[PDB]
């Protein structure tokens with residue numbers, strides 16, 4: 001229900017809407033988003049001509065980067081029409097002899113063999129009842145030496161937080177309720193075991209876990225700063241209610257990454 005024109009006011013030109021990676025401290029938002037995509041794609045050991053699946057591809061930035069820098073064939077899946085349309089157009093506009101396609105299709109319906117899989121903050125949009133099924137499907141469509149890079153948010157429970165010196169406040173519970181009752185992610189995040197245990201049961205080895213908690217804090221701060229700087233135009237595209245809701249989500253989430261209440265990581269998964 002939120003127009004691309006609203007998101008365009010605060011995202012960088014890649015349209016990437018997930019945790020960036022400030023590999024160098026002076027990177028711009030765009031450089032840090034490309035660095036996050038490259039950080040993940042480098043872990044897949046892509047050779048030109050391989051086929052990469054991006055599960056939950058958003059507006060196509062990682063797919064475009066994969067084609068341009070890694071010279072791979074690409075398939076992107078999304079359930080959002082707006083994500084599909086922009087991904088479709090952007091991929092068609094790349095000059096490449098490779099196959100590059102976006103699809104309005106869920107991973108549940110995708111059964112084609114691919115060489116490698118990437119996914120950036122789609123897994124939290126899956127129902128917990130599909131966590132194992134997702135890893136089983138991913139394992140099935142990969143070759144014997146296949147690799148998956150799962151970039152996913154995840155949460156911590158009260159006990160673990162407490163052991164780390166962190167408490168959930170009444171305000172945090174209200175913020176979680178706000179997330180669930182909104183168009184924003186973070187309401188029903190998986191735990192780390194939800195990711196690791198189900199991946200391992202499907203047959204994957206967790207070769208590496210790279211946490212990006214403080215990179216997300218910085219990313220969210222940048223989105224919030226951009227949106228506030230374009231407040232009038234954002235209100236015109238949507239409304240003051242929506243603008244304030246987004247600022248609440250962006251700054252509230254940034255605060256909570258800094259505090260350590262949740263995390264985001266890249267899981268390198270091998271067969």
Ligand SMILES: Nc1ncnc2c1ncn2[C@@H]1O[C@H](C[C@@H](N)CC[C@H](N)C(=O)O)[C@@H](O)[C@H]1O
Pocket residue numbers: 015016017018055056057058059077078079080083105106107108119120121122125126
């Ligand atoms: N079962 C599903 N299968 C495929 N895509 C899904 C599924 N559920 C949600 N999605 C898509 O996952 C994406 C979630 C986004 N947060 C991912 C953003 C994108 N990967 C980025 O880095 O900017 C959206 O494009 C959803 O439409």
